[PDB]
């Protein structure tokens, strides 16, 4: 559960004191010094002399054009949590400032303490100046090394998602999610700009937006700085904001003059933020508007105003580097140099280099700070689900009435098995879906929770299912979903996300961006305790798209899930569900997992059922199983070819494949792979099947025939160097689809039962089963004429129920 | 190149001292005192007794219709440019009002350094009143051998032009441009006063210009001063202007009241020239509105109300001379002796005849004052063009093709 701590949403009521205020401009000052010495020093981090070009590193890399402004933001926000005792997590949506977070990090304690080599004082100094961006160093970025971080940030655009995400269930944390305003042109921001309307103020917590509107990009001006000041505010209050704008820097007014005007204005907006709350407890019904601050500022405030005559300061020039190289001229070296010793750092710290003891003495202690807070370690917060016994939602028919009994639909299943999960675990567990739950038969859950929306409600013949508070949050953006999950993990919750299979892509980054965040984790962070992991429930799926067609069919989410697996971190998990038992297993072991992305792929339509739970299981822990009552062959030796599967609907064509071939006498193996990743190489991969085992599932002389759900190109890729592998001819999807009848759909990729039996045919005698195969040939071309003829697949097709059904 | 002199734009952020008011009364006092004596007296420049009419001029020429109010602004000026260290130039559009620069000059201390015969004590004070407008002497308007003078005023009408003209490519030069109301009426400056729309704020300096709307002109009032004013302050915004508006000595206010509530007002509008400075090192495309100062005064604003029955103060009585013969009556005398006595010379001078310490204790030194300010002497900055040489573009055809030859442009 999410804990409460320190005093939350207090009001002040007294002025901010002047001592704070002193203590907030030396904080800032030294953290402008530590996040340029960290971009250009080596060596001499406090400029004894004789400072020379010697101490300047030789490859200048990093960002300074965010930097100052987010060190003003983290001071005067630490100047809070101290004075409040707040609860609070940053979200520092521009990640290239990662110099700010690390002195942040530095000047609060925290950094030390995970990383003793760094410590405080001349030689910690110089080694914490070195590290930044550096051969065995640490990252530019705003990291998961980092404490205080759970948003990386290089890749922008879900600073305001992960922002909401991290505060649902979560009442007591207030977030500020400091906003470029570049980054505010990206596609997810402007959309997770509206999610202020799917969070209840009295059982979420609160994020305040700031806009860090400096005014430029890399190289180019941003459309918001550019616009009226009335269009921006105008733009904010139609998004449920009420605006607060601050100015400063853009003249000759004194820096004290400054930080007294923020106090003055941070605190008003705390007393709005506060009476939200405190009406949130009477009132939640009626959405309030939320403050948000626009932080107007020059980029790179405090660097040189020109260099080389180019506007430098208050440009776009002040990106990543000014002074691009101060090791190969002297005139740079000085502006280097006059600009180092305009922070005055003579002051800043003492004789032995530690910062000294009153530029930190408003500072928070213990889990008040931001490196210190269990929100931004969400793996410390963790606790397991409480999971209902999984026998209770197994489909027994199979057990009595013989495999491939029914009709069923998997996903409903592991909508019964949320539902209770949910019922067991209220404010710890959460489902999303970018506005497909109920197409994806997971509305089970209806029955114990409601959809949360917050914006208005009109009637209730159309309302049903809808309340202020609920744990289903459903918008459609596969962005806002996707940044909402993985901020609920990463604070310490549990979660589940639904989607169609085509529209995964639509965050193949956002994934990829968290898998790094895993790769990083698992390798060198072990500070960082395991989350819960990010479970994708990918339905929908290619072969039945009968409504939509060929726009909404693309599995290649395949295909980018696997280019994440290397160096034995196991952060990505793909799982084919054959039914809905064992969609069960899968779920369960899911659930109980941390620490990795799991994609379980499941159909919704009306499916038959092949396994018991305990076959599943048994079948779960190998990844690839022998289906023994339907093989004809009872050793490797008898079977003229093995029949691979990995899919439903590949199971399902395999399995009527099955039947032809056993009235014509083949010998045969059936062979189902739940999991795609034991098929990796047993050398790249300790947790794969190893080389005996995957000789043992597949002959090693006899063909193999593989249905595979996706592209065949991503089996092929994968067991290239397995034995036996020359054999294997994978047939998957090949971008042939439409809206057409089922059988259509297996047909024009070449997965269908016929097409399968003539495929195992020819690899074993294409001369001797030639009449046969001309047969099957013709039949799937009758088969289609029919479905054209009367608009539904044929009774061959349709009525084919598997002989081991009783 | 126009060099950068002391802290341009810098706002004050404190209030005006009650000190430095108290050396602008004195100032102002001092400063009318000396444009009397210059127009008035040949002899005995510090009253001492007998003070009789042997002491006057016997041909009394200049101007004093204006003199007072110059005065008055050019104190304000003076405490302005000594607490924020601004680079001024100041451009008297009335130059009549020639003897409110020459006391500036004899005030600041340039005027003595120029010509060292003019010394600050009795015999220099003497000297000074006497060189006003005789033979032999320094003119009746604003000279050129007046230090802190770049513009005579003599032919009205380039006040404004003369402004713009000296802030352009000059960041850090504020020009405060002094336009008489009559002034204001020739066809020169009623075009000279859309020129905001031909300057930058950011490559540009900035000028303010200072109405001096004392309501007259010789023998005649002005339009500016008698019509509404809704209508000035709306001509005014329609050319790209704010319009401040400064009232006084039209009623029996003290003088203290009136230096406060202009010390006020000025800084109110330095504030709004400041931010104006600010944000052209931001955004330069897009005009401001810069803001003018509206002075409105009586005419002749320190001397005496009535003179043979005929309203002088706030008339155009007093744009010459008032009391044209104080030579030739002893009641005009008496009228021109009360006159000397009202400012209270006795305690603005000392026994040796200088003006006593602390009545120019809040004015500025160095550079920065109006007489030696470089940019008034504009041949100390000049340096030579640098020149392409001319043979690169000698029309070489007729050294060949004979005298003659082509159909070219001259000018191009
Ligand atoms: C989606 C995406 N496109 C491009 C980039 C490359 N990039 C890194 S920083 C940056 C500019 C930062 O813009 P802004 O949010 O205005 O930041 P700031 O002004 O604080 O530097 C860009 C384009 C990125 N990180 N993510
Ligand atoms: C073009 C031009 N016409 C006429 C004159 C004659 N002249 C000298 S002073 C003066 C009146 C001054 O008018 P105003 O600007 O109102 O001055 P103030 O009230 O300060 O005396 C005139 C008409 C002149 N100097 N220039
Ligand atoms: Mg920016
Ligand atoms: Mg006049």
């Known amino acids: 559960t999410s804990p409460v701590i320190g005093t939350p949403w207090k009001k002040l009521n007294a002025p901010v004191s002047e001592e704070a205020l002193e203590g907030v401009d030396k904080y800032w000052r030294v953290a402008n010094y530590l996040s340029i010495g960290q971009i250009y020093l080596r060596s001499n981090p406090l400029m004894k002399e004789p400072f020379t070009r010697e101490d300047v590193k030789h490859r200048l890399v990093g960002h300074w054009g965010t930097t100052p402004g987010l060190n003003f933001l983290i001071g005067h926000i630490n100047r809070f949590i101290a004075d409040h005792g707040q609860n609070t997590v940053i979200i520092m949506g521009p990640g290239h400032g990662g110099p700010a977070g690390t002195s942040q990090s530095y000047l609060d304690g925290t950094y030390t303490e995970t990383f003793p080599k760094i410590t405080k004082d001349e030689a910690g100094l110089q080694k914490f100046f070195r590290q930044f961006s550096y051969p065995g160093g640490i990252p530019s970025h705003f990291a998961p090394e980092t404490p205080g971080s759970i948003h990386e940030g290089g890749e922008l655009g879900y600073a305001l998602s992960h922002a909401y995400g991290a505060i649902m269930d979560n009442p007591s944390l207030f977030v500020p999610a400091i906003v470029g305003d ?29 806009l860090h509107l400096n005014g430029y990009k890399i190289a180019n001006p941003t459309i918001l700085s550019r616009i009226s000041d009335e269009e921006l505010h105008e ?18 007014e004194d820096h004290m003059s400054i930080h007294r005007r923020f106090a003055e204005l941070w605190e008003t907006i705390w007393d709005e933020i506060c009476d939200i709350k405190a009406t949130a407890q009477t009132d939640n019904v009626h959405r309030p508007f939320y403050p948000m601050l626009i932080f107007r500022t020059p980029k790179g405030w405090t660097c040189p105003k020109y260099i080389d005559g180019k506007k430098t300061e208050g440009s776009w020039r002040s990106h990543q580097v000014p002074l691009a190289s101060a090791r190969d001229t002297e005139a740079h070296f000085e502006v280097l140099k006059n600009w180092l010793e305009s922070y005055k750092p003579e002051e800043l710290f003492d004789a032995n280099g530690a910062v000294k003891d009153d530029v930190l003495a408003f500072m928070p202690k213990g889990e008040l700070r931001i490196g210190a807070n269990p929100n931004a370690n969400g793996g410390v917060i963790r606790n397991d689900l409480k999971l209902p016994n999984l026998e209770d939602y197994e489909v027994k028919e199979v057990a009595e009435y013989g495999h491939g009994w029914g009709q069923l639909e998997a996903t409903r299943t592991l909508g019964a098995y949320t539902r209770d999960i949910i019922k067991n675990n209220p404010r710890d567990f ?151 038992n064992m969609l069960l297993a899968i779920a369960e072991k899911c659930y109980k997992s941390t620490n990795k992305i799991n994609a379980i792929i499941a159909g919704k339509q009306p499916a038959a059922t092949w396994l018991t739970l305990d076959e599943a299981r048994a079948e779960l822990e190998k990844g690839a199983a022998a289906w023994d009552w339907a093989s004809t062959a009872k050793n490797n030796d008898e079977a003229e070819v093995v029949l691979a599967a990995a899919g439903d609907v590949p199971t399902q064509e395999i399995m009527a494949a099955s039947d032809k ?71 998957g999807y090949e971008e042939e689809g439409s809206t057409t009848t089922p059988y259509d759909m297996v047909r024009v990729n070449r997965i269908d039962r016929y097409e399968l039996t003539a495929e195992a045919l020819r690899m074993i005698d294409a001369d001797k089963y030639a009449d046969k195969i001309d047969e099957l040939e013709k039949f799937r071309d009758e088969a289609f004429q029919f479905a054209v003829d009367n608009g539904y697949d044929h009774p061959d097709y349709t009525d084919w129920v598997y002989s081991g059904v009783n």
């Open 182 to 210: 570049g980054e505010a042109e990206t596609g997810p921001l402007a959309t997770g700009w509206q999610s202020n309307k799917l969070v209840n103020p009295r059982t979420d917590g609160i994020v305040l937006p700031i």
């Open 235 to 252: 733009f904010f209050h139609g998004m449920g904001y009420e605006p607060y704008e601050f100015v400063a820097g853009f003249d000759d």
């Open 430 to 580: 959460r489902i999303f879906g970018p506005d497909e739950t109920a197409s994806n038969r997971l509305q089970a859950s209806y029955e114990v929770t409601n959809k949360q929306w917050d914006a208005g409600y009109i009637s209730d013949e159309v309302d049903e299912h809808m309340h202020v508070s609920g744990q289903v949050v459903e918008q459609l953006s596969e962005h806002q979903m996707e940044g909402f999950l993985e901020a609920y993990l990463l604070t310490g919750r549990h979660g589940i996300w639904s989607s169609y299979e085509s529209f995964v892509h639509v965050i193949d980054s956002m994934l990829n961006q968290h898998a790094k965040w895993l790769e990083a984790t698992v390798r060198e962070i072990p500070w960082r305790k395991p989350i819960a992991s990010m479970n994708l429930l990918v339905s929908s799926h290619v072969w039945r798209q009968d409504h939509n067609g060929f726009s909404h069919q693309d599995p290649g989410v395949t295909s980018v899930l696997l280019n994440k697996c290397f160096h034995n971190d196991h952060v990505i998990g793909i799982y084919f569900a054959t039914d809905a």
């Open 661 to 731: 071939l056993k009235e014509l006498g083949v010998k045969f193996k059936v062979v189902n792979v739940a999991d795609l990743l034991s098929l990796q190489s047993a050398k790249e991969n300790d947790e794969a099947l190893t080389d005996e085992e995957f000789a043992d599932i597949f002959t090693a002389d006899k063909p193999v025939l593989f249905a595979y759900h996706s592209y065949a190109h991503d089996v092929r890729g994968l067991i290239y160097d397995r034995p036996n592998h020359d054999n294997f001819n994978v047939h």
